[PDB]
Amino acid sequence: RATCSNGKTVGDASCCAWFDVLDDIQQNLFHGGQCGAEAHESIRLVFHDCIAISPAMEAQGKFGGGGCDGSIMIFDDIETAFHPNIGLDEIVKLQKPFVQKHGVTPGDFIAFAGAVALSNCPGAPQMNFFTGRAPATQPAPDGLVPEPFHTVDQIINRVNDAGEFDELELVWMLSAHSVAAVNDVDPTVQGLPFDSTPGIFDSQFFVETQLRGTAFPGSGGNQGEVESPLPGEIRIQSDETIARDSRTACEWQSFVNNQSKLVDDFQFIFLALTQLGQDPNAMTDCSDVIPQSKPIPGNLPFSFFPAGKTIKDVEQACAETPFPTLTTLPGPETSVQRIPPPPGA
């Protein structure tokens, strides 16, 4: 343990340089510490860097990808052209100059920016940050990042190969869709959120994906898109099916009205994702650099039905426990506002 020049204690004096990186990204990437487009894009970038590993491919003498190696940045012209990585070159290009200026590894930076991004979102867990990711030497193969039109079987199998993650852990990692929008699936409109609170790390994603889908927020006929339950909200087929599948439905529902489980499980699974490709015992704990997460503001219940929705609108899929009869916000059904992204998204 060491004390940095700012008086903060950290796991190791090598962590102290990350306070310079923190100040720089908070002002110049996240527009003063916001949980907006760049924050959401950085959270997604962690998954797409890290899940690109495959012990199964390696066991046939094929490169399976290095996991959290910064390969999606170092080899951006290759990986960001893969279909599942659509729209990520925009955030890669915004991140690159910080990596160059601060002399940090591309994989460490991607993990850092994802943790800082989440710390900006009220309700987020206290996010971890470990260092020790050598620069990738090969780009990832394609076919390693899940698609919204993939089956539940293949997504379960994919995350079990990548990280020995089981079907329950697949549900936890999809909590990231609580602070997320879709730029590229609907060719007519960018920035359609997955839940009605894309600035808030909460279980609205788990509530709202359980509702009956009533309309497309924009165009119909988009591969891997299904009807959503609110105007301005997007829903993808993978989320819709995982929420109703007999293996995962009860786990999905368990996050409704359970902030502690949402926060504790996502803290765990995020750190696990950021260690793919690495020996955790070789890494340095710089978690004390990450800002203290903020609580959800206001005095409303943690989970709620959006205005215009009640228990009658829930497609209850959990045979163990009934979907909880939440409160319904007052007034007319309200449109979820789009989050316009930076150019090239």
Ligand code: HEM
């Ligand atoms: C496992 C199956 C998953 C599928 C099929 C999936 C699919 C999607 C799709 C289709 C989008 C919109 C992408 C675009 O339009 O460019 C998206 C956005 C996003 N995903 Fe996922 N995802 C998955 C898992 C995860 C995980 C595990 C995380 C993070 C831990 C994550 C974080 C995000 C975030 C933050 C966004 C929003 C990006 C933005 O606001 O620009 N996703 N996801």
Ligand SMILES: [Ca+2]
């Ligand atoms: Ca990678």
Ligand SMILES: [Ca+2]
């Ligand atoms: Ca949310």
